[PDB]
Amino acid sequence: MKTYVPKQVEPRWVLIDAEGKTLGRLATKIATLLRGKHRPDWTPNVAMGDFVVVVNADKIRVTGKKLEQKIYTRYSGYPGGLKKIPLEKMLATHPERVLEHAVKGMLPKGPLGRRLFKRLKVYAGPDHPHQAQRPEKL
Amino acid sequence: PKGVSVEVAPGRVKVKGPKGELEVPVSPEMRVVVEEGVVRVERPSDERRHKSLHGLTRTLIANAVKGVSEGYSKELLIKGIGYRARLVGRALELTVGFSHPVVVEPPEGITFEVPEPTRVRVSGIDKQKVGQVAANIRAIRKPSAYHEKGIYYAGEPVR
Amino acid sequence: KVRASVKRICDKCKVIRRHGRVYVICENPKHKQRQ
Amino acid sequence: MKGILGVKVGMTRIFRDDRAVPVTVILAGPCPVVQRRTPEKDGYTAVQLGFLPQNPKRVNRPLKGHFAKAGVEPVRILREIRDFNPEGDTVTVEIFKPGERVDVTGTSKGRGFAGVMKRWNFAGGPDSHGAHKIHRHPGSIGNRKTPGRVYKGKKMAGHYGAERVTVMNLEVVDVIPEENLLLVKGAVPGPNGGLVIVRETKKA
RNA sequence: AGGUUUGGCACCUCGAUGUCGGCUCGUCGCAUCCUGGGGCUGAAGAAGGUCCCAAGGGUUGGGCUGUUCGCCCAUUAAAGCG
RNA sequence: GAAGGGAUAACCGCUGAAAGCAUCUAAGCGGGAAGCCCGCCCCAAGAUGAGGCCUCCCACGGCGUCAAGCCGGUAAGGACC
Numbered sequence: 148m149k150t151y152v153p154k155q156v157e158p159r160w161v162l163i164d165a166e167g168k169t170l171g172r173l174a175t176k177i178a179t180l181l182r183g184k185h186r187p188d189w190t191p192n193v194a195m196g197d198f199v200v201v202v203n204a205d206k207i208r209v210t211g212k213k214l215e216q217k218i219y220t221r222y223s224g225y226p227g228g229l230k231k232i233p234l235e236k237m238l239a240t241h242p243e244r245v246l247e248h249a250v251k252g253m254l255p256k257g258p259l260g261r262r263l264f265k266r267l268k269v270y271a272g273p274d275h276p277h278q279a280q281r282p283e284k285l
Numbered sequence: 286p287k288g289v290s291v292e293v294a295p296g297r298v299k300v301k302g303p304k305g306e307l308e309v310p311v312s313p314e315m316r317v318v319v320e321e322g323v324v325r326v327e328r329p330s331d332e333r334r335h336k337s338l339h340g341l342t343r344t345l346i347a348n349a350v351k352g353v354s355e356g357y358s359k360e361l362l363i364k365g366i367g368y369r370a371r372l373v374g375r376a377l378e379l380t381v382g383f384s385h386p387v388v389v390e391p392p393e394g395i396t397f398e399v400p401e402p403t404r405v406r407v408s409g410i411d412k413q414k415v416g417q418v419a420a421n422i423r424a425i426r427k428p429s430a431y432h433e434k435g436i437y438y439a440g441e442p443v444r
Numbered sequence: 445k446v447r448a449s450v451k452r453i454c455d456k457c458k459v460i461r462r463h464g465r466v467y468v469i470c471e472n473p474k475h476k477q478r479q
Numbered sequence: 480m481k482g483i484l485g486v487k488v489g490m491t492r493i494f495r496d497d498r499a500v501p502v503t504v505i506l507a508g509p510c511p512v513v514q515r516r517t518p519e520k521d522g523y524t525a526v527q528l529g530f531l532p533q534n535p536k537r538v539n540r541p542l543k544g545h546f547a548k549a550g551v552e553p554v555r556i557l558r559e560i561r562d563f564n565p566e567g568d569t570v571t572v573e574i575f576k577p578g579e580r581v582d583v584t585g586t587s588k589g590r591g592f593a594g595v596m597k598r599w600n601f602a603g604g605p606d607s608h609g610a611h612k613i614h615r616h617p618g619s620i621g622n623r624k625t626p627g628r629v630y631k632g633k634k635m636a637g638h639y640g641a642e643r644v645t646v647m648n649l650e651v652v653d654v655i656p657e658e659n660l661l662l663v664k665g666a667v668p669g670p671n672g673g674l675v676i677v678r679e680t681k682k683a
Numbered sequence: 684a685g686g687u688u689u690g691g692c693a694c695c696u697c698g699a700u701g702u703c704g705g706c707u708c709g710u711c712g713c714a715u716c717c718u719g720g721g722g723c724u725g726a727a728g729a730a731g732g733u734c735c736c737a738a739g740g741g742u743u744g745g746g747c748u749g750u751u752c753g754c755c756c757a758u759u760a761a762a763g764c765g
Numbered sequence: 766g767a768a769g770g771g772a773u774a775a776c777c778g779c780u781g782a783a784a785g786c787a788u789c790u791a792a793g794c795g796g797g798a799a800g801c802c803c804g805c806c807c808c809a810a811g812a813u814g815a816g817g818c819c820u821c822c823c824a825c826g827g828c829g830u831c832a833a834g835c836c837g838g839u840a841a842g843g844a845c846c
Binding site for chain 6: 310311312333334335336337338339340342343344345348355369411413414415416417418419420421423424
Binding site: 601 | 706710
């Protein structure tokens with residue numbers, strides 16, 4: 148008989164930004180990071196993983212054209228309208244989300260993935276006025 | 286083109302001359318600069334993509350040249366009743382049937398010349414400035430109202 | 445100003461293909477079409 | 480955006496040349512400005528005016544008298560004026576010259592639990608012929624299986640009244656800086672003796 | 684192509700899914716009846732004809748019939764179809 | 766009801782190859798709708814991402830394994846009636 152359990156770790160954050168990347172192609176890696184999928188002391192039920200921080204938001208490439216080609220229905224008020232929003236908008240009118248959303252649909256659906264999304268901390272920087280230990284990853 | 290000063294950068298070109306310097310942004314491809322007592326342009330593949338993107342610049346730059354080397358022109362016409370214009374400084378106010386005379390804003394870098402009440406020309410260094418200023422004009426009056434009325438270029442009308 | 449099986453009324457009726465619509469037309473507004 | 484708290488007081492009419500005008504008498508009063516909020520500070524950029532004078536120290540902890548105007552905090556409370564910022568020392572009233580257009584705001588009279596067709600001027604139902612119990616009634620409210628529910632907005636009987644109302648472009652007739660008053664075009668929400676806040680039209 | 688007509692089939696429901704029409708309350712579609720744009724014209728002008736964008740908002744009151752529908756009366760920017 | 770900003774549909778164009786000519790298009794750029802986005806009005810921080818500002822009230826008195834999981838009075842204020 149065996150067992151393989153980890154005690155109370157210590158959230159080892161990460162500061163990051165590759166605005167030269169394609170969100171998604173990036174987001175994944177971020178998500179992968181979020182939940183401790185890289186750190187070999189796994190426990191899908193625990194909630195241990197990097198406290199990922201992304202700076203210098205946007206500036207993100209995005210392959211082919213999403214000049215209103217990428218729509219964000221996401222919003223369905225309730226009476227008769229399902230308000231749609233193209234990329235351009237979010238970029239101009241407060242971006243960040245752009246990447247945020249990309250991360251949500253990569254993190255699991257439970258109160259955990261919900262909790263994990265609480266880790267991610269993206270800003271439209273550069274500048275992450277919120278850290279005491281940014282371990283910028285490459 | 287002795288009066289020309291062809292400056293080269295990554296994917297843009299600053300052409301200086303007796304008239305002025307202009308930005309001719311182009312593709313980061315070719316690294317085509319100034320080879321000899323003149324300017325040249327090359328290409329990589331033979332892809333309909335490049336050929337098309339190529340030559341396009343061959344002309345492009347070539348205009349920054351001729352542009353500084355005294356590039357103006359843009360003539361117009363009229364015909365009819367109160368179809369004429371009185372140059373108000375750097376801009377004009379041509380009237381044409383409209384119950385309210387038209388004051389055409391004076392564009393920067395572009396000069397408006399009123400030779401007469403009839404004929405008229407737009408002077409300036411560019412194209413995107415001049416041609417775009419073909420709209421600023423012809424857009425006032427049409428053509429084929431079984432002719433006469435309206436302003437024209439220098440070309441010829443059709444019954 | 446059209447929709448199908450065209451051979452180009454007159455040569456003037458040059459096929460003007462822009463944006464996405466394939467609208468060929470001559471100088472003549474009678475020889476004008478739009479797919 | 481010229482602020483100025485005030486109170487509806489009633490209304491009558493006056494004349495001009497030879498035509499009668501419906502005027503509602505607002506009573507704005509000197510408004511001891513008691514606060515500002517620069518973008519460096521709070522972020523908006525407004526003015527915390529004050530109203531009803533007298534107040535037997537019922538000010539307790541929020542004495543906020545760190546502004547001379549204090550004059551005994553006007554219990555008629557304070558309410559900003561989004562983008563206003565005059566010479567901080569009582570907003571006069573002579574702020575408005577005749578012929579100007581304001582955008583009065585007040586509280587609609589509380590009509591309680593209003594019934595549809597009063598709350599929505601609904602049709603109701605034959606007072607004869609057909610049935611007799613569904614007279615005032617909203618009739619149907621949906622469809623069948625699909626969608627199988629009531630829309631998230633259907634109008635229904637409900638609390639109607641006592642709310643934030645904003646009538647616009649009211650022409651400012653006369654202005655009695657003397658007894659401190661203000662006249663306009665009747666259409667001003669709320670019962671007499673109401674917290675009304677006069678602004679400046681947005682016709683321009 | 685669409686699933687608005689008329690039909691075909693007989694898969695759920697016969698220990699029950701009340702079935703025309705009106706009223707009330709509507710909400711959605713565009714294949715647009717008005718009102719916004721635009722290209723053609725065998726478009727001089729004023730009218731029109733046709734096709735293309737485009738539903739934000741409109742889309743009347745009566746006579747006759749249980750009528751839906753229609754036909755009339757009187758209007759209308761229009762008196763849209765589903 | 767709107768003014769006015771911005772971005773577009775059809776469509777109208779400037780420059781311009783590929784294709785020595787020519788084209789609104791491919792790289793580029795302008796104007797274009799009762800429509801779209803922002804403006805006007807109203808709700809709104811249960812926006813657990815629980816915001817901001819202004820002014821107040823101020824110390825453990827005593828109990829294990831020590832931050833209460835336990836009480837005994839408060840303060841500013843708050844309810845009761």
